[PDB]
Each structure stands twice: as structure tokens, then as C-alpha cells.
Design an enzyme around this catalytic site. Structure first.
Site, PDB file in Angstrom:
ATOM      1  N   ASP A   1       9.368 -17.141  22.502  1.00 19.19           N
ATOM      2  CA  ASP A   1       7.957 -17.202  23.283  1.00 19.19           C
ATOM      3  C   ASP A   1       7.330 -17.240  21.385  1.00 19.19           C
ATOM      4  O   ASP A   1       7.401 -16.215  20.925  1.00 19.19           O
ATOM      5  CB  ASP A   1       7.831 -16.706  23.779  1.00 19.19           C
ATOM      6  CG  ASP A   1       6.291 -17.023  24.254  1.00 19.19           C
ATOM      7  OD1 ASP A   1       5.770 -17.396  23.461  1.00 19.19           O
ATOM      8  OD2 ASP A   1       6.403 -15.806  25.032  1.00 19.19           O
TER       9      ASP A   1
ATOM     10  N   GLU B   1       6.044   2.260  -3.193  1.00 19.13           N
ATOM     11  CA  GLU B   1       5.897   3.092  -2.967  1.00 19.13           C
ATOM     12  C   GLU B   1       5.490   4.278  -1.402  1.00 19.13           C
ATOM     13  O   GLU B   1       3.999   3.690  -1.175  1.00 19.13           O
ATOM     14  CB  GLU B   1       5.279   4.031  -4.537  1.00 19.13           C
ATOM     15  CG  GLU B   1       5.701   4.094  -5.382  1.00 19.13           C
ATOM     16  CD  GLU B   1       4.864   4.626  -6.937  1.00 19.13           C
ATOM     17  OE1 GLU B   1       3.241   5.166  -6.572  1.00 19.13           O
ATOM     18  OE2 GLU B   1       5.761   4.769  -7.839  1.00 19.13           O
TER      19      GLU B   1
ATOM     20  N   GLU C   1       3.919   6.935   1.666  1.00 20.13           N
ATOM     21  CA  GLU C   1       3.449   7.394   1.762  1.00 20.13           C
ATOM     22  C   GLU C   1       3.528   7.934   3.549  1.00 20.13           C
ATOM     23  O   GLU C   1       3.288   7.034   3.764  1.00 20.13           O
ATOM     24  CB  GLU C   1       2.383   8.042   1.203  1.00 20.13           C
ATOM     25  CG  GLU C   1       2.212   8.106  -0.529  1.00 20.13           C
ATOM     26  CD  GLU C   1       0.903   8.403  -0.814  1.00 20.13           C
ATOM     27  OE1 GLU C   1      -0.047   8.525  -0.270  1.00 20.13           O
ATOM     28  OE2 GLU C   1       0.492   8.510  -2.383  1.00 20.13           O
TER      29      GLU C   1
ATOM     30  N   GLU D   1       4.401  14.810  -1.260  1.00 22.52           N
ATOM     31  CA  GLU D   1       2.205  14.478  -1.634  1.00 22.52           C
ATOM     32  C   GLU D   1       2.060  15.607  -1.433  1.00 22.52           C
ATOM     33  O   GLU D   1       1.812  16.617  -1.141  1.00 22.52           O
ATOM     34  CB  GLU D   1       2.428  13.351  -0.899  1.00 22.52           C
ATOM     35  CG  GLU D   1       2.215  11.913  -1.026  1.00 22.52           C
ATOM     36  CD  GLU D   1       1.239  12.096  -2.521  1.00 22.52           C
ATOM     37  OE1 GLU D   1       0.580  12.368  -2.707  1.00 22.52           O
ATOM     38  OE2 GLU D   1       1.996  11.454  -4.132  1.00 22.52           O
TER      39      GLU D   1
ATOM     40  N   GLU E   1       6.494  10.922   0.115  1.00 21.61           N
ATOM     41  CA  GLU E   1       6.776   9.755  -0.751  1.00 21.61           C
ATOM     42  C   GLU E   1       7.953   9.658  -0.518  1.00 21.61           C
ATOM     43  O   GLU E   1       8.469  10.378  -1.094  1.00 21.61           O
ATOM     44  CB  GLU E   1       4.863  10.080  -1.609  1.00 21.61           C
ATOM     45  CG  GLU E   1       6.100   8.414  -2.274  1.00 21.61           C
ATOM     46  CD  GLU E   1       4.949   8.396  -3.699  1.00 21.61           C
ATOM     47  OE1 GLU E   1       3.703   7.630  -3.342  1.00 21.61           O
ATOM     48  OE2 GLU E   1       5.290   7.953  -4.904  1.00 21.61           O
TER      49      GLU E   1
ATOM     50  N   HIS F   1       1.403   2.204  -2.400  1.00 21.31           N
ATOM     51  CA  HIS F   1       0.569   1.749  -3.752  1.00 21.31           C
ATOM     52  C   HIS F   1       2.306   0.812  -3.948  1.00 21.31           C
ATOM     53  O   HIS F   1       3.121   0.774  -4.140  1.00 21.31           O
ATOM     54  CB  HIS F   1       0.813   2.390  -4.898  1.00 21.31           C
ATOM     55  CG  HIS F   1      -0.014   4.179  -4.751  1.00 21.31           C
ATOM     56  ND1 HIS F   1      -0.336   4.958  -5.399  1.00 21.31           N
ATOM     57  CD2 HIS F   1      -1.161   4.099  -3.983  1.00 21.31           C
ATOM     58  CE1 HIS F   1      -1.361   5.324  -5.467  1.00 21.31           C
ATOM     59  NE2 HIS F   1      -2.191   5.167  -3.865  1.00 21.31           N
TER      60      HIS F   1
ATOM     61  N   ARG G   1      -5.714   7.353 -13.789  1.00 23.42           N
ATOM     62  CA  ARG G   1      -4.547   7.119 -13.200  1.00 23.42           C
ATOM     63  C   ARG G   1      -5.091   7.059 -11.716  1.00 23.42           C
ATOM     64  O   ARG G   1      -4.074   6.364 -10.652  1.00 23.42           O
ATOM     65  CB  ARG G   1      -3.412   8.716 -12.882  1.00 23.42           C
TER      66      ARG G   1
ATOM     67  N   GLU H   1       0.425  -1.112 -11.336  1.00 23.77           N
ATOM     68  CA  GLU H   1       0.157  -0.681 -10.023  1.00 23.77           C
ATOM     69  C   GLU H   1      -0.785  -1.120  -9.158  1.00 23.77           C
ATOM     70  O   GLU H   1      -2.086  -0.587  -9.702  1.00 23.77           O
ATOM     71  CB  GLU H   1       0.987   0.807  -9.989  1.00 23.77           C
ATOM     72  CG  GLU H   1       0.674   1.151  -8.610  1.00 23.77           C
ATOM     73  CD  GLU H   1       0.688   3.378  -8.828  1.00 23.77           C
ATOM     74  OE1 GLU H   1       1.843   3.879  -8.530  1.00 23.77           O
ATOM     75  OE2 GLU H   1       0.101   3.502  -9.781  1.00 23.77           O
TER      76      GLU H   1
ATOM     77  N   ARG I   1      -2.986   0.034  -6.470  1.00 19.51           N
ATOM     78  CA  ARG I   1      -3.530   1.611  -5.286  1.00 19.51           C
ATOM     79  C   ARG I   1      -3.959   1.324  -4.047  1.00 19.51           C
ATOM     80  O   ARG I   1      -3.680   2.357  -3.203  1.00 19.51           O
ATOM     81  CB  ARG I   1      -3.979   2.059  -5.978  1.00 19.51           C
ATOM     82  CG  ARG I   1      -3.137   2.578  -7.657  1.00 19.51           C
ATOM     83  CD  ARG I   1      -4.161   3.531  -8.538  1.00 19.51           C
ATOM     84  NE  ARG I   1      -4.124   4.881  -8.017  1.00 19.51           N
ATOM     85  CZ  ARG I   1      -3.516   6.347  -7.658  1.00 19.51           C
ATOM     86  NH1 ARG I   1      -2.521   6.456  -8.971  1.00 19.51           N
ATOM     87  NH2 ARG I   1      -4.282   6.553  -7.463  1.00 19.51           N
TER      88      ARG I   1
END
Lengths: 443, 442, 233
Positions: free
Chosen positions: B52, B130, B132, B187, B194, B243, B314, B331, B333
Site C-alpha cells: 500500500d 555527524e 548528535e 557533545e 555524536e 551537520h 566555527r 559543512e 550545519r
């Protein structure tokens, strides 16, 4: 290997340490019945039959013939999927005879066998694949059944992932290696709800298997600390449980619902079969949907249908026609719930379909719209009727029906309607907690 | 390596595999499955499996609902637990309508189309995600809680109690189904962890992100704990993101690397970034899918609530790690683990591709703390915000032609109607914070 | 103002609690402060006109037009807290749609049957958390500019507005009140009409404090979120 003779059964009892044999049958209403025979008594049972009280099938209500004989059927012998310390356990079924040697007409299984004989007089055999929805609940501290959820997943979610993940796998494994041949299983729409889909198969062996499924599943869940419920509607506000019945007719292994030369690739006799089913379904809704709680599932808003219609496209009609063609052409009837007697219920689907084929009952047009969103006049203009709204209303429909009376036999017909009448009369007089919540402050 | 249905059936027999599980997602990123007995598997490979389609697309509409799954033997994977009854494996496949064309409402199909479009330019996508999560306690009845399993912080050696063994078993289970962890660490938030996975082709990676979630959850449940992938289970500590590092490859070489530029990034790297910056607001509704997602996208934590790129900072929305060479990566994020990864990775891929095709400049990097600027300071910089809540993300996406074409109309509309219902439910709730603030006051 | 603390004091002292929260319980009616108003000039009701068929003056219509033109710009005054917008949801007494009518009693602005001296306009969106001084000030200012600028309020809306489509409402041009306090704050932040009527002092003090209130609320994780998502994700 296949058990065909009593010697095959008696040899298999020896080789696998089978210590107890359980008979398996149903009463008029669909309650699973049984009794225990020690292995040591089994050879005599194959020789003379087994005497037993027919009140187990027909109730205690009336003075009637009551000493019945069970003629065991060796081909129905099947080992059950648990090994007690005491030894292996099996089930077996049989034919019930009256003391004069005539078959007892009140056994639901005989009722199905007469529909089988009718289809055979027309050159047909019926297959069924049922779809058994159920709920997996927790036991309370005393081991009693509850409605406590085991997960909050939804439709086809990979859930549960805790201890209940193992119980669900256990239930699947037990059925498969009993010999069920499951095709699939999934999580269903409601929290803690599940569906196991049977293989398409001969209708007699299918109905036999639906009964076995019910108590194997309950015993597995109980012994793991959980409860498997086949109630149609244990919880308000979430989906109920149904038993959709896919079905088809065969003429010596050729699917009679298939016709490669038509635009839909469905045969004419398929449409007549649908026409017969739609013509009589109101008159035996009390059989497919047999308890008060069935009609709390037959309300709008969920997987449960309420309106009598057929369709391919619309996955929510009463009769639904999957896209499969060739050998696997089938029609799905969606209203039944799992509390029903599968013998009585498959038999009346077969009798109704065979009448549609015999009488050329045109099923009308298909309804492809959502029927809930329509008005009464549109539904009236479409002629779209609805199923009975409650058990009393279903009973009255059945009461006036000579089709259902002929198909079931007078014994079954009248036993069924009396007991269902009594259950409704018990239900109707109850003052429910909902009434006090609404009216005590007000009145 | 599983290549053929004959490889699979032999390995099923050899390793006592009794149950096969399919693995797919619906429009909204919920993981979906049904169980195939190993006796059914040869028939399944030969005829497909009918199911289905309301599992993928829901029930709200009358549309084609009888689908066919064609099993893909190279996605067969044995799961990291061994029931007494026998072994278990997961499998994927392609979904077909009865008329024989692919079903376009399958999120995996949406990702293949982005893979297929990127191949018209000779580009292929790699992802190293990555993930978490929070490792929480169960209560007395075996049900989830947000009760902590430790009080540790960033990169701590914690837990050191029985939950030390759960975390190890989780890392062990994934590694030994062939995930190839790079690293895992504690983390920022208490009880938060993570796991960083190796780079792989985006299709294998998206399949593995789905596997990971239920594997991690089931492992934790069976040790007595709960693994939670909520964006913001707890106020006042960090939330959980997903990320999504990404590389583009051509002729065997990393499209983003240039040994001769001052930063050693290629021009297409900047164009890829420009494309992501241009469209990200329009599919925040997909990378940040639930109401709770925007309790994570508030200032004060690891979550990026502003649209900008950077190598130095960062905490920019797009980050360039210092790694160059064949491992040059970008990356992104903002996503969180509740997103459908097939839809997220396809939209990132399309957006980056759009940036390269149309040469979309990313502008200047933002090297400073964007939070510590004024509302005018950032408007001086022309720095926009991510949508502040689900309703806002929905309205940004409903008016996007880029998103609508990338997902296809069926996915686009289904996704939006369902999320609009989820918001219309949440906005009427009277929360206990309102009673605390107002009952005495008014 | 005297009413709220007299009622609260009386109730407290008898063992009960009187609540003016806009919406303390989910799924049942919220609480409004409906505002009946009339203008007068030389002892006569400005809204009453015997010679018209409806018996409403042209100045009554201008006064409703001014209220409609500006109600979005100061809903954050008439409905000043986060909980105001949990009553401003469809299904109950409260309006959410900017309309006017006599025959429909759900309307944001309703004109009761009363004529002569008792002729009045009823504004139904405010709740009893608002500042009555500020709310009445902006009511009077909005209606006065409708009379000054001869603002035509358009056609009355006599149907049930809930039962329509956004195409039906977009055809009629029926707009919605701000859906939450943030949307109301933004709408007020840009209104020169509200700034001039209230003054820079009040206008800026009020908006800074309401934004701070919103920023606190928007970041909170609610149990509803834990019920819905914790087991799912």
C-alpha cells in the site's frame, strides 16, 4: 511431509513425542472450542470416533440432540509451535455426526462445506487470503489483559523497538514454522496495532487456519508477558481492527475473475460475483460484524467502511479490487472484523457471489469519490446505501433474510439470532459512565 | 559484497537469516518497514512485492495506492542482533506504480533524480554526516524520559557507569554492520553524544542514516536506555543537529580543491556555497521539519540561526574545515536529525548544482560573532536569519519554485499540507508556561 | 481598572479565584472584553440616522471603516499577551477575521439592532488583559480618522467566514488578524498611526517589553512537544 492417513499421524505422534492432542472447532457464534485427548487415547479416536456434548456448539438453550461424534480428520493434524517440558502438542479437526450417522448441520464447518459443495456443483473452488489486524497490549501486575499501549507507532512504522520487538518476531516465527506461510506483516495505523497477511489458499484450510491463528497468537503473547486482542474497537479515537477477505474463484486452477480480453482485465463473472456480494451483505453483516463493539468500528473517520460500494481506485470502498491480474486476481471485502466465525462468514460470501454469477447480478457503477464527504441527496442520488449502524439493526436485517437462512440452515440461523438478540438486550439496558459524565451535572 | 539476488539468497541460507525487513521513509521522514519471511524472499526478488502506497504518501487523498517494491540485492544488510529464532536483515528497493513507471513520491526516488542530474555534469556527491543524539533513561514502565545518564560536557570521558557500556555497544554495533565510524565523542549537552561516519556516496549514506536511527534506538532499548533524536529535548542546554559535510567529485578529483588559489578552494566551491546560501531559507522546512526544530534554532548554542559562510568562525551556517586535497569538504550545519535525509541531501545537492551552473557568488565570509552584532549591524552586513518557526519555514517553502521542482509536485504538496496541519494543531495549545506567567497576573 | 481588583479581592476572600486570562483552558471559549461604543455631538447619537433605511448614519459607516483600516496595527494593544492568540483561533466566540456586519453575530465589528440613543458599534477582539486606556484611545482614534477621511468600510459580511476558502476570502478580500504576538508586534512596529496616537514614549516602551516577552516564550520547550516527539524521533 503431508499427513494423509491415521498411520501417518500415529507415526508422527511417536517420532516427535506428541503427548496431547487438541480438537479445534467453533460454536455458532465463533468462539474457539477444544478439548484435550492424551496421545494414548488417539488410536482409538481414529477407530470409533469421539463422543462429546453438542451443547458446546449449539449452546444449552434448547432440548435437542446433544451426544455427537467427532470423526477425526488426519489431514488436519498439525503440531503447535511450543514445546512444553511434558512434550509436543498438536491440533486436529473433524466432522461432527449425529447418533444416526448423519452429519450435524449446526457445525459452522459443515456450513462452509455445503457452500464448497455448491461452488463445486458449478465447477468452482474458492480461495481466501485473510488479513488479521490485532492489538498488542501490556498485561497488568496481575497478568490481566489491559489496553495499555506497547508503542505509539503508526502505519508501517518500524515499531516497536524494545522488548515487544522480540514478541512480534516470535509471533511471526511461530506461525511460519507451524506451516502458515505468511506473506507479510506490518505495523498498522493505530498505536500498538499490527497486521499479518495470510497466503492465499483453499477456503476450508484457510478458515481452519484463522481459528488456529487466534489462540497461537494469544498464547505466544501471554507467555511473553503481553496481550493480543482481536476486539474490533478496543480504543475510541484510533483505528479498529478488521479482517479483510481477499477472494477469488478458480475453475481447475484458472482464476475465473481474470479475462485478458477486457479493458479492466476483469471477467464478467467477477462483476456478477461482486453484484451478488453487494446485494446480500446487509443481510449478513450480523455474521461478519457480530458483536456490539463491531459497530463502534463501523463509524466514519478510519480504515473501517460504512457505505456499500465497489471500486478499484478507491482504497476505502466496501469491496476493493487490487491491481493484480492473472492468477492473483481477487476482490477484497473490507467490512468484516476478526471477532467473526470465519466458517459462517466465508460461506455466506461464497453463497452470495455464486448467486450473483448464477443470476447475472450487475453490480452497478463503481464509486470512486470519497463517500464520507458526500451529502445524503448525492448518496441517495447515487443509491449509496449504508451498512447496519448497530447490532440490533444488523440482526433485524438478518431476521428477514431467506438467503441467509437457506445458506446457514435453520438450526444455525435461529441459534445465531436468538443469542445475538440476548446480547443486545443485555447491552441496551446498561447505564454507561459516559451518561453520568454528560447528564449527572446537567439534569 | 552483495551484488546479485543469488548472492543474497546464498547468504540468507548460509547465515540462517529468517526475516527480511524492508526499509523506506514517508514524505515526512518517518522510517517505514514490513517483515518478509525468508521463505518469501525468492518470490519477492522474482515478482516484486505489492504494498500500500499510503505508507509513503498518507491517506488524505484518493490517488494510486497499490505500489510494487522491486528489491535491490546490493542493499541487503544483516542487522547487528541475533534472535534465537534466527538472523535478521534489512533490504531496500525501488517503488513502482502498476503501470510500470517509478513512483515519484518516494523520497529515495527524489534523491536519485538529483544524483542523476548531477551526473549530467559529471559530478558525484559524497556525504559524511555527524549525528548528535541524547542517551536518556527509561522510567519504571519501560517508556522514554528526558532523565539524564550523565552530567558531562564537550568531549568528556563520560559516562563511566553502566551507560559507558551502552555507548560502546552502540558504536560497536554500527561499526560491525559496516558503517565505518570515524569517531564518536560526548557533545556539549549533558547526556548528549555524536557519531561521525566516514564519507560515502550520498545514496549509500542516506540509506545508512535511516538504518542508524532504528539500530541505535533498538540497541539502547535492549540495554534499558533510550536514544532520542529530538532537536531540543531539553530547554537551556544544547540541541542535536545533523551537520552534513559534502564533497563533489569529477574525473576522480575533488571539485572543491584548487592547489593554486590562496585558500586552496576551487571556484566551483564558492559557487556551490552561493547556491546553498541562495536557497537554504526555502527548504529550512525540510532540514528542520518539526515544531521542536525551531526551539533548537534560537541563539545561544551550537545551532546556526544566521545565513553566512566562513572558514574561520566555527559557528557560521556554512563552514569550510581546513582539510584540503581529496577531502576538501563543506559543512552545512543547520539540519537536525528529524529530517528526511533523502530530501535534505537532494535539496543541498540541487542547490549547490544550481550555484555552479549559474555561477552564484557566495559573497564575503563572515569572520565575526554574528550574535554580538546589532540588528542594524547585521543589516549593514546584509545578513539574513533562518526562519524563526515552522510556520515561517512553511511559508518560505510554499512560494519556492526551486523547492517545488526539486521535490516534484506530489512530494512538495503532500509535505506542505502535512506540516501545515502539524502547525495548526500546535498553535492552539495552551502551554503550562502560560499558566505560570499569567494565571496570577491577569 | 477598579473592576478587576475588586472582583479578584472579593473572590479570593470567599475561597475562589477570578481569572482574566484570555484563554486559561484549551478547547473551551476564551474570554473577551467586548467594546460597545457610541459617538455623540450636541446631545445626539452620531451613529443614528432615522431617514436612512438601515437607520445608521454615514458617520457610523466611516467610523467602522476607520476601525477596520487600523485594527491589525494595534491588535497587540487590544490582545497584549501570548495567550491572547490562543483565544484568537477558529472555533469559539472570538473573531479572527476582519469583517463587519449586523446580521452575523460572530463579526469582528457588529452593529446590534438598537437604534436611537442606544445605537452602538461593538468591537469583539479585545480581551480583559488589554490596557483599557490604550485600547479605548486607539479605538476612538481609529474611528475618528475614518470620519475625518471618509473611509468606506465596504460591504458587510453576512455569511459564516470559517466555512470559506482562502480563495473565497481572497475574493472577498477578508484578511486575518495577527496569528500570534510576534505577528502583532511586527504589525504595530510599522504603524505611524499607532505611534502618533500613543506617543513615542508609550509606543517604544510597549514594543520593547512585548518583544522581550515573545523572545522568552518562543525559546521554551513545551510538554506538548515531549508528548508528540520524544517517542517518535
Amino acid at each position: 511431509k503431508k499427513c494423509t492417513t491415521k498411520e501417518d499421524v500415529l507415526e508422527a505422534v511417536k517420532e516427535r513425542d506428541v503427548k496431547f492432542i487438541r480438537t479445534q472447532f467453533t460454536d455458532t457464534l465463533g468462539i474457539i472450542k477444544s478439548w484435550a485427548i492424551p496421545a494414548e487415547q488417539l488410536e482409538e479416536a481414529f477407530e470409533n470416533g469421539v463422543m462429546f456434548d453438542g451443547s458446546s456448539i449449539q449452546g444449552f438453550t434448547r432440548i435437542e440432540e446433544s451426544d455427537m461424534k467427532l470423526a477425526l480428520d488426519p489431514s488436519t493434524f498439525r503440531i503447535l509451535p511450543w514445546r512444553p517440558a511434558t512434550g509436543a502438542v498438536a491440533r486436529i479437526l473433524g466432522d461432527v455426526y449425529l447418533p444416526d450417522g448423519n452429519p450435524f448441520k449446526g457445525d459452522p464447518r459443515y456450513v462452509l462445506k455445503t457452500a464448497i459443495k455448491e461452488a463445486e456443483k458449478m465447477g468452482f473452488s474458492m480461495n481466501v487470503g485473510p488479513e488479521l489486524e490485532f492489538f498488542l497490549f501490556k498485561l497488568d501486575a496481575n497478568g490481566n489483559p489491559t489496553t495499555e499501549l506497547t508503542d505509539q507507532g503508526g502505519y508501517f512504522d518500524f515499531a516497536p523497538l524494545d522488548r515487544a520487538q522480540d514478541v512480534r518476531r516470535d509471533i511471526d516465527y511461530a506461525l511460519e514454522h507451524m506451516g502458515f506461510q505468511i506473506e507479510a506483516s506490518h505495523h498498522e495505523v493505530a498505536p500498538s496495532q499490527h497486521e499479518i497477511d495470510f497466503r492465499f489458499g483453499d477456503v476450508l484450510c484457510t478458515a481452519d487456519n484463522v481459528v488456529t491463528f487466534k489462540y497461537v497468537v494469544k498464547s505466544i503473547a501471554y507467555h511473553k508477558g503481553y496481550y493480543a486482542s482481536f476486539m474490533p474497537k478496543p480504543l475510541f479515537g484510533v483505528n479498529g481492527s478488521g479482517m479483510h477477505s481477499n477472494q477469488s474463484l478458480f475453475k481447475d486452477g484458472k482464476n475465473v475473475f481474470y479475462d485478458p480480453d477486457t479493458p479492466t482485465k476483469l471477467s464478467q463473472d467477477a462483476m456478477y460475483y461482486i453484484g451478488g456480494l453487494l446485494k446480500h451483505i446487509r443481510e449478513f453483516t450480523a455474521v461478519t460484524n457480530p458483536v456490539v463493539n463491531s459497530y463502534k468500528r463501523l463509524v466514519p473517520g478510519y480504515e473501517a467502511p460504512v457505505y456499500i460500494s465497489w471500486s478499484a481506485q478507491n482504497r476505502s470502498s466496501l469491496i476493493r479490487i487490487p491491481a493484480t491480474r492473472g492468477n492473483g486476481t481477487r476482490i477484497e471485502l473490507r467490512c468484516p472484523d476478526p471477532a467473526c466465525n470465519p466458517y459462517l462468514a466465508f460461506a455466506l460470501m461464497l453463497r452470495a457471489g455464486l448467486e450473483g454469477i448464477k443470476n447475472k447480478i450487475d453490480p452497478g457503477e463503481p464509486t470512486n469519490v470519497n463517500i464520507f464527504h458526500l451529502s445524503d441527496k448525492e448518496r441517495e442520488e447515487r443509491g449509496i446505501r449504508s451498512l447496519p449502524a448497530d447490532l440490533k439493526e444488523a440482526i433485524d436485517e438478518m431476521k428477514g433474510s431467506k438467503f441467509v437462512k437457506e445458506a446457514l440452515g435453520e438450526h444455525v440461523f435461529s441459534h445465531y439470532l436468538c443469542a445475538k438478540e440476548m446480547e443486545w438486550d443485555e447491552y441496551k439496558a446498561v447505564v454507561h459512565p459516559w451518561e453520568l459524565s454528560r447528564y449527572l451535572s446537567m439534569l
